[PDB]
């Protein structure tokens, strides 16, 4: 239900009930940021953030009724603009 949602992750694979995504955003998501499909249905929230600076990955804790195993490689996941941090926040 945000007015606009931004591309955030591309499906990599499930991991023990979570969705693992490769980031397709230049910015870092807030912990627990709602994560949506393109049509803006919420499917979970950001759990873990990991990976090197130039290839971040993140996990999605799936919401009620959402199964990690139901998605396929390259399926996109989205985030509100106001739930992103510039990477410079984490660097010296």
């Amino acid at each position: 239900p945000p007015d606009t949602v931004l591309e955030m992750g591309a499906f990599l694979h499930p991991c023990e009930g979570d969705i693992v995504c490769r980031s397709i955003n230049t910015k870092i998501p807030y912990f627990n940021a709602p994560i949506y499909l393109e049509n803006k249905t919420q499917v979970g929230k950001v759990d873990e953030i990991l990976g090197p600076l130039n290839e971040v990955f993140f996990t999605i804790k799936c919401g009620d009724g959402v199964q990690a195993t139901s998605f396929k490689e390259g399926d996109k996941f989205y985030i509100a603009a106001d739930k992103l941090l510039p990477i410079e926040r984490f660097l010296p």
Partner: protein
């Protein structure tokens, strides 16, 4: 004999090793029989300027371990090179008394680990572990196990062995202080899809010392004190305790004249007339070590002159004291 005379040194110990390669500002100095070459310190001052390269066993905390050493040695102060979790073994640098002044540097230094990751299922392509380990080298995002996202660097890593049936991988990693192997293991599991956690962990290098550099056990420490208490033979204590100067062997050196040592300790500045010898390649604001002619570490310092300036300057401050190590009145006051 290992003292620069007032007039091949590759076998000279510790901070005087290869001192003949230091550039010479002045060939002469008036010697003062204060202090001692590190290896020749009397037992009490040897221990009080001492460091133990300890192989921490699995189960006690680093704090527990350091308390045990203090009780054994009956020393005034102990501190260490960075907390190994209770189950983690290996290199824990225990600083005694005056050596405690070097704790902060030891804790901020890089570390090396050998780690076993336990994967939660077999991999189909066994080579995927090595690939994901390589993927997770560099400046990495880690949230510490109230906890903020941060970046820590894994400089290099190497997969040593992987048993896909036992679901166990053993790897080596060189990292920045504060990098969590526990979190790396989780992350490897996520990148691999099967999931994972850290099975066990050993620290194989902590900054200046590795597990190959006269690492000793708690049993060694207890036994060394026992032999001294019962037979008054110092040799076991001297074998297991290393001079704090051991931690400073990587530093570019400046040697201070005996008559200037006390002044450095108090006033926190080395001046040109106090300068004896100096290392090549010292640049402005480089962190260096100031040492006596007997190889004692006076202080870690900030160079206020480059090597080239040290040759051509007639006056001025050569270095400024960052942390004084030597006891202030070890060497005598000029006035």
């Amino acid at each position: 004999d290992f003292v620069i005379k007032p007039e091949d040194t590759s076998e000279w110990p510790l901070l005087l090793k290869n001192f003949d390669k230091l550039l010479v500002r002045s060939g002469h100095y008036t010697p003062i029989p204060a202090g001692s070459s590190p290896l020749k310190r009397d037992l009490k001052s040897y221990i009080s300027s001492g460091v133990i390269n300890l192989d921490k066993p699995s189960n006690p905390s680093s704090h527990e371990v350091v308390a045990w050493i203090k009780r054994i040695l009956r020393c005034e102060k102990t501190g260490h090179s960075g907390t190994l979790d209770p189950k983690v073994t290996g290199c824990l640098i225990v600083c005694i008394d005056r050596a405690t002044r070097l704790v902060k540097s030891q804790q901020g230094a890089g570390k090396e680990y050998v780690c076993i990751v336990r994967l939660h299922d077999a991999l189909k392509d066994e080579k995927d572990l090595g690939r994901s380990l390589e993927n997770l080298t560099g400046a990495l995002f880690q949230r510490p196990p109230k906890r903020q996202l941060r970046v820590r660097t894994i400089y290099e890593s190497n997969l040593i062995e992987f048993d896909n049936k036992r679901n166990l991988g053993v790897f080596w990693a060189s990292c920045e202080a504060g990098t969590y192997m526990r979190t790396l293991c989780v992350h490897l599991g996520m990148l691999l899809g099967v999931g994972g956690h850290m099975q066990e962990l050993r620290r194989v290098r902590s900054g200046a010392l590795s597990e190959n550099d006269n690492m000793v056990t708690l049993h060694d420490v207890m036994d060394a004190q026992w032999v001294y208490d019962n037979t008054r033979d110092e040799s076991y204590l001297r074998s297991i305790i290393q001079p704090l100067e051991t931690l400073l062997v990587g530093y570019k050196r400046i040697v201070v004249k005996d008559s200037a040592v006390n002044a450095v300790c108090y006033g926190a500045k080395l001046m040109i007339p106090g300068l004896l010898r100096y290392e090549e390649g010292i640049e402005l604001y480089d962190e260096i070590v100031l040492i006596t002619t007997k190889g004692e570490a006076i202080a870690v310092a900030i160079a206020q002159m480059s090597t080239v300036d040290l040759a051509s300057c007639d006056h001025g401050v050569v270095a400024s004291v960052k942390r004084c190590i030597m006891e202030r009145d070890l060497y005598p006051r000029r006035w």
